[PDB]
């Protein structure tokens, strides 16, 4: 069962937070791979500029729908109109995130909430919406996450708390769907340090560490989402890909799959 | 662990009207400590307070109010503190009422789980810290299996629980570096006795439940012993598997 770029040729894929960084990269790969793609963010021409670039690369469609993921209702009707546009949904790629920097937690609950709303809560809203379509297409879901979403790490509390939330939620939903005969794929991506303009500015000269390529990360998340893989791991450290895997949990879950 | 640690200690106990929250209250009382329990049901908070104000507690008060309200939680530590002239232990243990069900479109419960179960815990903490730094006190977040492993029918519940982990486990690290001598103990509990759970897993889940009594105590001990985490559950398999070695190792690698 090998991945084929040709696999994503007629698929109507949505990609959130595709204005820049990873998001944008996934947008291009999927574009060049000739497929209907809808990018969303909060940037007039920043999007207007990637849509153009997509069509050129060899898309098959390309639009955009600006709106902050803070307004749950935007995500509400976003999926709506993004669907009343491609005609159904074949693979949602939630990936957007409220911008965050490195800081020790003090009293910024507003920012704790923002994250826990944008980074997580909106991902549910987007899913609920896209589900019907997805169920009907046997779509795949891809929730981009971080190492911080698997391991405790200082200076990124509110951030990590949200990515952890996505695991606790999507992995559980995955299980319900499993037994609920629903044939909708659900991929979770734990990413290591990626060379985005965002990270390489929010951590450069601060939280010491080396990053991995951007585009190589985007397509990887893709082969993973497409192959209906459970989770995808992508980090430039061998020994990390080695440890980040927790089989104790896999077993405990299995053992508990009979109760 | 010696009970001569809790005696005369100022301890808060959210979710203390019934269930594990309540029992913890009694122990803190029999152990002659100062307690301020909360929840929503005034009537119930009355009954435990006196019961506590007779089990040996050096002081026992209650303050009803919904943790869905953020300024309430915020105003809760201030009064709870003045009531006992300072704070020693903060025990977040309250959860928004739920049940077993696949997920569908009730984001209201999804949004509320992360409000009551998670967001309020940060509120309670940020406002209780000063007094906690004021006595090298502790914090005790109560989680559960679903908070370490993914389980169906509790997606919402689990999401909030994983949040607590990512957050506090992340905060604790920031702490040991910030010269913040306040401990943070995450409790990972299996199935517990309490009716407000037992009555929800009626014929749907199979596992011999552990007793509130013991579970309640164990948690307190762990917090008193400043233990990063308390693993309590009847089943033997869990206590072993539930622990995460790779995460421990993967983490020790940054520090
Ligand atoms: N970069 C890294 O090192 C790592 C990244 N990750 C994961 O990668 C994914 C994306 O990160 P990355 O692409 O590098 O980061 P970027 O900051 O470069 O991209 C953020 C994207 O989010 C969009 N966005 C921000 N706020 C909102 C909002 N309110 N509504 C809609 N869109 C919004 C942005 O557009 P705009 O703000 O203009 O609306 C933009 O296109 C996340 O899921 C993240 O957790 C994980 C580990 C490491
Ligand atoms: N019993 C079990 O098997 C398990 C329980 N746990 C953990 O133990 C803890 C609680 O124990 P549990 O046995 O479930 O206790 P209960 O189910 O009996 O309920 C605990 C409390 O929640 C309170 N509560 C509900 N809504 C609110 C609110 N908005 N604000 C304040 N309090 C509220 C209730 O009082 P009121 O409604 O009057 O406010 C009551 O005191 C939770 O953190 C749970 O996550 C973990 C694993 C298993
Ligand atoms: C978006 C990016 N996500 C990351 N998540 C992680 O686990 C990495 C690899 C770390 C380095 C934090 O270990 S970086 C991020 C960058 C800065 C910030 F303040 C919060 C988050
Ligand atoms: C609050 C209580 N916590 C539990 N936490 C878990 O992980 C247990 C042990 C499992 C699910 C695995 O049996 S039960 C709970 C009670 C009712 C409900 F509908 C969902 C959760």
List the structure tokens of A254: 């299995």
Partner residue opposite B151 with nearest CB, options A124, A149, A256? A256
Which residue's entry shows tokens 């190492």?
A147
B237·A259 Cβ contact <8 A: no
CA distance B29 to B211: 19
To the nearest 10 degrees (0 to 180), the angle between helices B42-52 and B19-30 is: 30
Resolution of the structure, angstroms:
3.0
B27 is in an annotated binding site: yes
Instruction: Determine whether the shortest distance from the Cβ of B120 to ligand 2 is under 6 A.
Output: no
User: In the numeric block, which tokens belong to residue A62?
Assistant: 């390309």
Comparing alpha-carbon positions, the chain B residue that sits nearest to A157 is: B167
**CB within 8 Å: A161 and B163:** yes
Pick from A19, A113, A126: which is nearest to A82 by CA? A126
Angstroms from A255 CA to nearest CA on chain B: 9
Classify A214 as helix, strand or coil: coil
Is A22 known as a binding-site position? yes
Question: Is residue A194 in contact with ligand 1, taking CB distance under 6 Å?
Answer: yes
Alpha carbons A104 and A161: distance in angstroms, whole number: 14
Catalytic positions of A are: 159
Check A121 against B105: CB less than 8 A apart.
no
Determine the residue of chain B that is closest to A249 in CA distance.
B149
- Is the Cβ–Cβ distance between B187 and B178 less than 8 Å? no
CB within 8 Å of B43: residues ≥ 6 apart: none
Tell me which chain B residues have a C-beta less than 8 angstroms from the C-beta of A125: 107
Q: By alpha-carbon position, which residue is closest to atom 12 of ligand 2?
A: B19
* Total count of domains within chain A: 1
Residues in A touching B141 (Cβ below 8 Å) = none
Q: How many CB pairs under 8 A join A and B?
A: 171
Chain B residues inside the 8 Å CB shell of A174: 150
Chain B residues touching A107 at Cβ < 8 A: 126
Which CATH number fits the domain that encloses residue B57?
A: 3.40.50.720
Shortest CB distance from B149 goes to which of A116, A164, A249? A249
Question: How was it solved?
Answer: X-ray
Q: Whose CA is nearest to atom 19 of ligand 2?
A: B19
Atom of ligand 1 nearest to the CA of A193: 3
Report the distance separating Cα B215 and Cα B21, nearest Å. 10
> Is residue B13 within 8 Å of B59, Cβ to Cβ?
no
Ligand 4 and B95: CB distance under 6 A:
yes
Mutate which: A145, A161, A166, A241, vs B, most B CBs within 10 A: A161
**Full domain range(s) for residue B156:** 1-255
Shortest distance between the Cα of B60 and any Cα of chain A, in A, equals 29
DSSP collapsed to 3 states, chain B: CCCCCCCCCEEEECCCCCHHHHHHHHHHHHCCCEEEEEECCHHHHHHHHHHHCCCCCCEEEEEECCCCCHHHHHHHHHHHHHHCCCCCEEEECCCCCCCCCCCCCCHHHHHHHHHHHHHHHHHHHHHHHHHHHCCCCEEEEEEEHHHCCCCCCCHHHHHHHHHHHHHHHHHHHHHHHCCCCCEEEEEEECCECCHHHHCCCCCCCCCCCECHHHHHHHHHHHHHCCCCEEEECCCHHHHHHCCCHHHHHHHHCCC
A184 contacts on B by Cβ (under 8 Å): none
Give the distance (Å) from ligand 2 centre to CA of residue B93.
6
Q: What does residue B21 show for φ and ψ, rounded to 5 degrees?
A: -60, -45
Is B246 close to A245, i.e. CB distance below 8 A? yes
Residue A233 known to bind ligand: no
C-alpha angle B108-A229-B162 in degrees, rounded to nearest 5: 40
User: Rounded to whole angstroms, how far apart are CA atoms A100 and A111?
Assistant: 9
CB contact set of A156 (below 8 Å; sequence gap of 6+): A100, A102, A148, B170
Is B173 close to A154, i.e. CB distance below 8 A? yes
Tell me the C-alpha to C-alpha distance, in Å, between residue B141 and each of B34, B92, B120, B189, B198: 19, 5, 12, 11, 21
Residue A258 assigned as binding residue: no
Catalytic residues of B: 157
């Amino acid at each position: 069962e090998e991945f084929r770029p040709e696999m994503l040729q007629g698929k109507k894929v949505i990609v959130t937070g595709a204005s820049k960084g990873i998001g944008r990269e996934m947008a291009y790969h999927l574009a060049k791979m000739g497929a209907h793609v809808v990018v969303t963010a909060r940037s007039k021409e920043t999007l207007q500029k990637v849509v153009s670039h997509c069509l050129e690369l060899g898309a098959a469609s390309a639009h955009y729908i600006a709106g902050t993921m803070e307004d749950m209702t935007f995500a509400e009707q976003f999926v709506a109109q993004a669907g009343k546009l491609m005609g159904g949904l074949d693979m949602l790629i939630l990936n957007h995130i409220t911008n965050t920097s490195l800081n020790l937690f003090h009293d910024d609950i507003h920012h704790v909430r923002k994250s826990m709303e944008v980074n997580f809560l909106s991902y549910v809203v987007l899913t609920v919406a896209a589900l019907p379509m997805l169920k009907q297409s046997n779509g795949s879901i891809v929730v981009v996450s971080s190492l911080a979403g698997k391991v405790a790490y200082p200076m990124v509390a509110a951030y990590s708390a949200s990515k952890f939330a996505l695991d606790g939620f999507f992995s559980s939903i995955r299980k319900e769907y499993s037994v609920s005969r629903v044939n909708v794929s659900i991929t979770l991506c734990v990413l290591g340090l990626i060379d985005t303009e965002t990270a390489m500015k929010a951590v450069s000269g601060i939280v010491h560490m080396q990053a991995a390529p951007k585009e190589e990360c985007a397509l990887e998340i893709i082969k993973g989402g497409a192959l209906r893989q459970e989770e995808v791991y992508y980090d430039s450290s061998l020994w990390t890909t080695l440890l980040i895997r927790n089989p104790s949990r896999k077993i405990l879950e299995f053992l508990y799959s009979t109760s």
